[PDB]
Design a protein around this ligand. Structure first.
Ligand SMILES: [Fe+3]
Ligand SMILES: [Fe+3]
Ligand SMILES: [Fe+3]
Ligand SMILES: [Fe+3]
Lengths: 200, 238, 238, 200, 238, 200, 200
């Protein structure tokens, strides 16, 4: 067959992933410019939300040395690629769970609708990549919203999952925290209730 | 906004490490027991951040100087440099490369590192840089030392430096570890041995690069990284 | 009624694929985690139906004509033939052999096949036949096309035809797949790679048979299937 | 040591097994003669029963593309091996579960008793073979009846299973479907309550 | 008008097939018995048409749609693509590439094809395309079936597609045939065996290209054609 | 010595060459634009001629599945390389002989004179390439005109052919078809009167 | 592919082929029973004929050490396989050209019509195999009759030959010799007028 050069193999981020990538959460001084958990400056368009969740292992213990990167469209269904700390909105951001903060958070806006490669709209989602010690190659998932039930039933992606129960693990449950709209999205890596992870 | 004009070569999950690799103890509870769900690539997987306008400090690729409490770090001064290409051998310009590593002693500047090797007060351990028009990146740093860990009763990670490379999309983002030419710890570590094909391991080993060394000052190593192949879309929905 | 006068060679479960072969995704939730319990062979296991009196239609083995809607299927005309023998080399006479497959383009005539390649109006995809006194069987059909499936992201099944074979007892019944000689898809298919030993993979590649081809008409492939060896009981209950 | 020719290797029956083995079911036109689920015709001797079950995977979900082959003695405990669609009793049959049918059913008579090789009687049992996608080699099981507790307690095959709670998995439960005597045999492939599978 | 500024590497007539290869029957009465006369290259030989302005239809390279009679051809969907370069490795831009072939079953849409396999109502069999600035070309079609022919008594052509390529000059124009990787018919075909050196046979086997395939849709093959090297004239008439 | 990449090998054009190169002729529907046998349109400059020939094999039988490509200077002796179906003159064309047509024909103007690499003029000639089944690599020839005897006697290409009777085979014979000026060039592939073929 | 045991390779019969096979024509005593040139006893059914011919080499010289075996149907279109010297008719026979007899002969009956594998009638023919020194593997031909023009135009075999002139070489020209109907059939092995030989 035709053989290309091989991709460099993945390796675990390890316990000290924070020092290269969450300088604050390692409790080390920062630089002038850091990629972090504020996607939306408070004056950006769309519905402002707060995301949070916990990450469990197969024994049901909290994973507190975990790192998350996210990618999502703005409120109009557009992916803003030029990262800049001066934009009102960026489509990328990073967040982490710590020994102190067992929980992660992210401040952003509910993403609008994007179409897939066939022109079919997917429901609002945020793409999530999860790295931590013990994970050899990061895990890809998607975060969807419970108040979008209809778009969720028609999604070409959520419908590639055979079992209806497994679709429920990608669904974040709406709540409120200090008068602000919040969604909780917990990740179970292994076991009872395992979140669905994707390949692409 | 970004456009969906690209497709990425499918990863080979037989070349990368598997999620469950029992000798690497922590992977036992941290790995899916269910199969990964394949999905077709869409604009959500085929676009990614561009860090061209992030504002880098003057010394962010320079670990000999970016921490500095009026002194130079202790340890082998080395330049680590290389190029980032895709599987077609096409350079990947303006991509973000970030790296973190311990000190000359195996100690990390982090609260959980309870290891008995001391901190080096002139050394932080982090850098970042953007590749150039041709795919080149470069760092100045000190060779890290090996450290022990609580895995088996006498395990030691070989000297390594962590790298995260963004590439053009989130389909290409990757976290890996570079290892040093001839370190006899390499074939013994369970984290390296989680990569089953040895050729795949061979790609993680940085080679001593004397042509790039500065005489009387610092050695150099060369590490090139290969990101998933990018091709134009062809014959889609006819 | 059937008599217990026979024993069958115990199966080599390392020769056959294992239950759990994770690269073949569906097998994760479909395989027992406890061990198979081992039972001595009784008459419940060593007898099996004989299908000699089954009423076969004239074109049951002839896939070029058994579906037919005023026409000929499109694709490579081929005869597939062979012989059924046990592990000792004894022929297996008046055995039921069933087969099914996709059309030339890789589409199966079944509701669950959502694949874009079209249905061929003159092709069904099923055949059956009883082996002769010498263990020979034969069919005529069109070479199936390979097809994609949702396992990994760009996984493709090589061309194959499925086979079922009853044999003398229910201890001998087997379902398998024939592949075709030289198909570069063979080594890449995770279902094929579920068989660990490469000499076992070989036993499933039907080889091009020019001596059996009909000049100016159709090519032929040969596929010989070997069932568990059957022996007479000796020294039992003393 | 002595080597014989090796056995052709098994391959999964795949998602399309019905196209070649359960014609009606793939929703395809049939042939004049098919091997199906009526083992006994209404004027056959013995007690008429109806069996049914469902097939589960490791996550507690139905296996809707399974295909089962069964082999059993008639009512006086004899294996009728000469298959014929005119005989009043065939010892062999075939059934499937479909996206439409989550359940398989088989119309047969309760089998009689047969001896093992050593002369010891076995409790009434149906022999079962199971095939489906994701199964590389088929599985062997035995269906026993719950109202045959004394014979079950002395069967020399059920006694080869070490643990008692494991012998239970092999016991179909007497019930009623349309007021006609029935037995329910559910198969759990993997997990909690995994059905015992054999090798011989 | 075209200028004589180029020369082309002389052809290796031992690399190419010879004229008389008797196992390929027709070649007996079709080959010159006298020697080819050798002529220096002039402008008559080093210039050739350029087809940039030729009016190509939208589906000229797309055999799945260019004939179409409310439908899709039956057979293996494949993209065949590659690159055209000269012997020095220089790409050959805006070159004409033509191809033709049988259908899935081995029948050609032409009066002289008397073969029993049927015509596919949605398939023509011709395509054309101009190479891009980098020398890339591509088409989409169905994999042809092999077919019998009257040469020897049970001779069968392997699956192939025919190719024509113009190149920069009439000294570079070539007609050839692509075969497919692993076809056990390849080594047996007397037309293929007209090429004496086995490394030359290899250059005609299009290889399976998984990185170029469209997941869940069509596979791809790669075929790169190499034309005579073109150089600038040096030291001529002194 | 220095080796370059080797040249893809030639393969016969086969019996079905017309299906991809001479569409009308395979009796197939054409595309809007085809490369065919009219090199000159009626308002093109130069003397209009009509050429024709027949193709023979070694036994004196017609080759009815041949396909010819021609390349020629226009009337002022220039190679028009930019092919266009609107130009009044294309230097390139294509023709075939069919079971229907034993003969090929080409509608062109008599070409002008061009110099070789050394500056010496060549006699008017059409360059010809021939393809058919049984031909593994195509053949090269030149068509010269019989009424251009003086230019032919001094052409530096015709003079490279050692034997004089061999130079004759390259000379098309002036004749008349429908009272329109024509030249006849017959090709003998093998045998008595074999046409000279070139290599360059 | 599938490989069978190889056929034993052929070798020339050589100059002394006569001693093992034409004992009379080598001028050696015969045995009680010889396979020879009289297919038809004079009282057998059908039209009695005499065949003769000469065999030339590529230089047009006579081949006088040649051996021919023949196979043909009787007058009803039936091949009589049981060879017996007492039958009125045998379908096999042998004949030879000698230093004395430059010509071969055979006494037989015009064969009736047989059908081919598709049920299509072939014209009357006799199958001929020719062995001699200088021939490494014998040559197969067929002898057809000139007074059977119509059946000859419809023959599926004579029509597998592309060129009409080459069909004429298998056609024997009717003559008379001493009041007896005779056909002359000459074989040219090579060259001008080469007889057609077959593979099967
Ligand atoms: Fe580390
Ligand atoms: Fe299949
Ligand atoms: Fe062809
Ligand atoms: Fe001899």
């Amino acid at each position: 067959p035709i053989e290309l050069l091989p991709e460099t193999p993945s390796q675990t981020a390890g316990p000290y992933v924070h020092i290269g990538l969450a300088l604050e959460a390692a409790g080390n001084p920062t630089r002038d410019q850091e990629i972090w958990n504020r996607l939306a400056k408070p004056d950006a368009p769309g519905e402002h939300i707060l995301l949070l969740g916990q990450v469990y292992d197969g024994n049901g213990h909290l994973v507190r040395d975990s790192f998350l990167e996210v990618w999502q469209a703005d409120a109009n269904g557009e992916y803003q690629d030029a990262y800049n700390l001066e934009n009102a909105f960026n489509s990328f951001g990073r967040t982490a769970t710590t020994f102190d903060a067992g929980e992660w958070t992210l401040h952003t806006v509910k993403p609008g609708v994007v179409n897939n490669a066939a022109g079919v709209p997917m429901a609002p989602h945020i793409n999530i990549s999860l790295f931590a010690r013990g994970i050899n190659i990061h895990l890809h998932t998607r975060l969807y919203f419970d108040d979008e039930a209809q778009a969720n039933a028609k999604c070409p992606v959520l419908n590639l999952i055979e079992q209806p129960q497994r679709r429920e693990t990608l669904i974040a449950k709406r709540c409120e925290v200090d008068g602000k709209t919040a969604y909780r999205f917990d990740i179970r890596i292994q076991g009872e209730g395992e979140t669905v992870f994707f390949d692409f | 906004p970004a456009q969906d004009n690209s497709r990425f070569v499918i990863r080979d999950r037989n070349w990368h490490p598997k999620a469950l690799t029992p000798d690497y103890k922590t992977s036992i509870a941290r790995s899916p027991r269910q199969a990964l769900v394949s999905i077709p690539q869409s604009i959500s997987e085929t676009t990614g951040p561009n860090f061209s306008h992030l504002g880098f400090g003057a010394h962010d690729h320079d670990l000999l100087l970016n921490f500095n409490n009026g002194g130079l770090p202790i340890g082998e001064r080395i330049i680590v440099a290389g190029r980032v290409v895709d599987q077609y051998g096409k350079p990947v310009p303006n991509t973000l490369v970030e790296m973190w590593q311990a000190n000359a002693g195996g100690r990390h500047r982090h609260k959980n590192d309870r290891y008995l090797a001391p901190l080096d007060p002139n050394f932080g351990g982090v850098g970042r840089c953007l590749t150039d028009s041709d795919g080149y990146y470069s760092f100045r740093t000190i060779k890290p030392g090996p450290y022990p860990w609580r895995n088996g009763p006498n395990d030691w990670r070989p000297a390594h430096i962590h790298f995260g490379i963004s590439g053009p999309s989130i389909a290409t983002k990757l976290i890996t570890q570079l290892y040093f030419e001839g370190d006899p710890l390499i074939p013994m570590c369970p984290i390296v041995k989680s990569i089953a094909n040895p050729e795949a391991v061979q790609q993680l080993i940085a080679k001593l690069d004397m042509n790039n060394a500065n005489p009387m000052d610092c050695l150099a190593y060369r590490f090139d990284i290969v990101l998933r192949g990018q091709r134009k879309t062809h014959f889609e929905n006819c």
